[PDB]
Structure 1
Amino acid sequence: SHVIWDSNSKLMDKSDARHCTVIHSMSQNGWEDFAEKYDLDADDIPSFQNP
């Protein structure tokens, strides 16, 4: 929906930047095993492109 990325898109090998556009979104139940990454302040008070 909110992710539109213009970079390369052609060669399946991608000799280009070698990084897909990385965007991850879920609901507040994402505690899960996700506490196995980051979890210091656990909220950076960000927001991303919500229309």
Structure 2
Amino acid sequence: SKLMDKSDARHCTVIHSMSQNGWEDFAEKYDLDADDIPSFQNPNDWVFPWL
């Protein structure tokens, strides 16, 4: 894509980071199997020592 509004882009990927209860909520909303825990490329790092 060579446009600021990204209208030339033919595809886009959005990464969702959600807690466990959020995972069951998402699975119920989209009719997914909550047992199979998903995984993807991790958008955020752990440079800060978060608990």
Q: TM-score range by the shorter chain?
A: 0.3 to 0.5
What stretches of structure 1 of length at least 5 have no aligned partner? 1-8
- Please identify which structure carries the higher helix content: 2
What stretches of structure 2 of length at least 5 have no aligned partner? 44-51
Residues 20 and 50 of structure 1: is their aligned pair in 2 closer, same or farther, counting only changes over 3 Å?
closer
Q: What is the aligned length?
A: 43
Within 1, Cα distance between the matches of 2:18 and 2:5? 29
Residues 25 and 41 of structure 1: is their aligned pair in 2 closer, same or farther, counting only changes over 3 Å?
same
Identity in percent: 100
Runs of 4+ in structure 1 deviating by more than 4 angstroms, as ranges, are none
Alignment TM-score, normalising by the size of structure 1: 0.37
